[PDB]
Each structure stands twice: as structure tokens, then as C-alpha cells.
Amino acid sequence: MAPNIRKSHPLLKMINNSLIDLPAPSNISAWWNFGSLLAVCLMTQILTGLLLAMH
């Protein structure tokens, strides 16, 4: 079986297997931070968007 509930759980195994135990090159520069920012924007846009759609 799987000891920790981070590597076995059908869901957390995902949050963990794609953003926490994910293998990343040790030398990625600031130019690699745009991925997340793009991601963050999406969530921020979507949120502020709904709020507006409600008016």
C-alpha cells in the first residue's frame, strides 16, 4: 500500500504529482515565472468577470 495520503489518494496524488513533488530544473530563470502568472491571471479574470456578469 501507500504510506502517505499524498501519493495514494486519487486526487491529492494529483495536486502533489503535478505541483509539489514535480521535478523542476534547478536553473530556470525568471523567464519561467510567466507560466504561473498566466495561470493566476486566468483565475483572477474569471473571478472578476463573474462578479461583473452579475450586473
Binding site: 509539489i20 513533488d21 514535480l22 523542476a24 534547478s26
Partner: protein, 271 residues
């Protein structure tokens, strides 16, 4: 990383379409004339063209139906974006991230957390500062003012520009003095991204150790930076000429130069 890339390009196009229709919702002067020109683009497609415009509008000239099916469309796309983003990131994961030197980093990987989670939190608080400094202190700095004037079906504002992020294309569209050519050039101005992976000749992956590609690369950036300026100016000399140039310049640096200097560089390394 072809698939990660191609889904990217798809993302870009989707974000563009989204931001466009959003900009139409407040139904201001740009809102309207933008809606009119962009949907009119299909009119360049022979036959099924003039019809394609009819759906787009839902009538025989921009009006209410266009505005409601646009709000629907805007409401929807973002999610499709979020959806595809998941795939983008999934294809990625097959290979792993690339790195500046462009040589395998298997000999040295690290756990995303806390290395990059912290680095991204920081990268966030940095972008966030000017974004908020801008939005709070100078709200309209980045946006066209025509949209403060309720749409007028009879008057096209004389200073009609698109939102800053589309200028560069608007610039190219205004280069080719032919309906279909301009349209094709416009399409290609973004769709050309699909060809990049295939126009790679260097035996190395990045430009870190390619000084000639670098210069060409930065020459290209300044190249777009110009088209943007051009897109924000009237269709009069000297602009018109400078315009056609930057465009011609854009497509050459990408389809002809890069792949050429690339090959050249290979020979200088003795490969």
C-alpha cells in the same frame, strides 16, 4: 516541445478572441466598430463568406443579436481556456521543463515546492505591484477613450485604433493594400507561430550560446515594438512606408533569416 507549444498557440488565439468580445460588451464606439470590422473579416472568404457574416451578426448589420451572442461567447471561452491550459500543462509534464542552457537537467532536478512555489509567490507580488499601481493610480492609461461614447451606427471615429495588444496586427492589416492580402497577412501574423518548430536549424537548443541568433532575436522584438507604434498612427506618410517595411521585416526574420543564420552558426562551430 511541439504539443506543449501548439496548444500554447491555440491558447493565444483563444485569449485573443476572448479579450476581443469582452471589449465589445460595454457597447461603446470602439466596441461597435470593432465588432463591425472583425466579423467583416470573414467577408474575405469567397462564397461562404458573405453568409458567414450573417450568422456572426444574427441579422444583416451589427445589432442586439450580435451583442447577446457575444456576451454568451465571452462568458464561455475563458473556461475553454482553463480547460486547454490543463492539456498544455499535461503535454508539458511528459518531458519536463526546459532550462536556459538547453541541456538535460536530469543530473539536477529539484522539487517544485518550496523552490518554485516561493519563487512564483514572489514573481506574483512583483507583477502585481505595477498592475495595481496602474489600475489604482492611472486607470485609463492603457485604454482607448472612444469607448466612453455610446456606439453610433452612423459615425466611425476618425481615431479608431484597437486595444494596445492588437495594434501590431492592425498594423500589418493596414500594410497590404488589398482586401484578401491584408486579411491573409493578418491571419498569418499569428498563425506563423505554428511554423516555428519546423524552422529550427541550430544544432543547439537555445540562443544562449548563439550570438548571431540573439541579435536577430532582439532585432525582431524591436521590430514588433515598431509595428505597435505604427498601429497607433494614421494611414499617412512616412508611416505607411515604415509600416510595410516592419511587416516585410517581421515575416523575413522569421521565415528566412533565423533558419538561415541558424545553419550558418552550425558551420562556424564546425558541425
Amino acid at each position: 516541445y511541439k504539443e506543449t507549444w501548439n496548444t500554447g498557440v491555440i491558447l493565444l488565439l483563444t485569449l485573443m478572441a476572448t479579450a476581443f468580445v469582452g471589449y465589445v460588451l460595454p457597447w461603446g464606439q470602439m466596441s461597435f466598430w470593432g465588432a463591425t470590422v472583425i466579423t467583416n473579416l470573414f467577408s474575405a472568404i469567397p462564397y461562404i463568406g458573405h453568409t458567414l457574416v450573417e450568422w456572426a451578426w444574427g441579422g444583416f448589420s451589427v445589432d442586439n443579436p450580435t451583442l447577446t451572442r457575444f456576451f454568451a461567447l465571452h462568458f464561455l471561452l475563458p473556461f475553454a481556456i482553463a480547460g486547454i491550459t490543463i492539456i498544455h500543462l499535461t503535454f508539458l509534464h511528459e518531458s519536463g521543463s526546459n532550462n536556459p542552457l538547453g541541456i538535460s537537467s536530469d543530473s539536477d532536478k529539484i522539487p517544485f515546492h518550496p523552490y518554485y512555489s516561493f519563487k512564483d509567490i514572489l514573481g506574483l507580488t512583483l507583477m502585481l505591484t505595477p498592475f495595481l499601481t496602474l489600475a489604482l493610480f492611472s486607470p485609463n492609461l492603457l485604454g482607448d477613450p472612444e469607448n466612453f461614447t455610446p456606439a453610433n451606427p452612423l459615425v466611425t471615429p476618425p481615431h479608431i485604433k484597437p486595444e494596445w495588444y492588437f495594434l501590431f496586427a492592425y498594423a500589418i492589416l493596414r500594410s497590404i493594400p488589398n482586401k484578401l492580402g491584408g486579411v491573409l497577412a493578418l491571419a498569418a501574423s499569428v498563425l506563423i507561430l505554428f511554423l516555428i518548430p519546423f524552422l529550427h536549424k541550430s544544432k543547439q537548443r537555445t540562443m544562449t550560446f548563439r550570438p548571431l541568433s540573439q541579435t536577430l532575436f532582439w532585432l525582431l522584438v524591436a521590430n514588433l515594438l515598431i509595428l505597435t507604434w505604427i498601429g497607433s498612427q494614421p494611414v499617412e506618410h512616412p508611416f505607411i512606408i515604415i509600416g510595410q517595411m516592419a511587416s516585410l521585416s517581421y515575416f523575413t526574420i522569421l521565415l528566412i533569416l533565423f533558419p538561415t543564420i541558424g545553419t550558418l552558426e552550425n558551420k562556424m562551430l564546425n558541425y
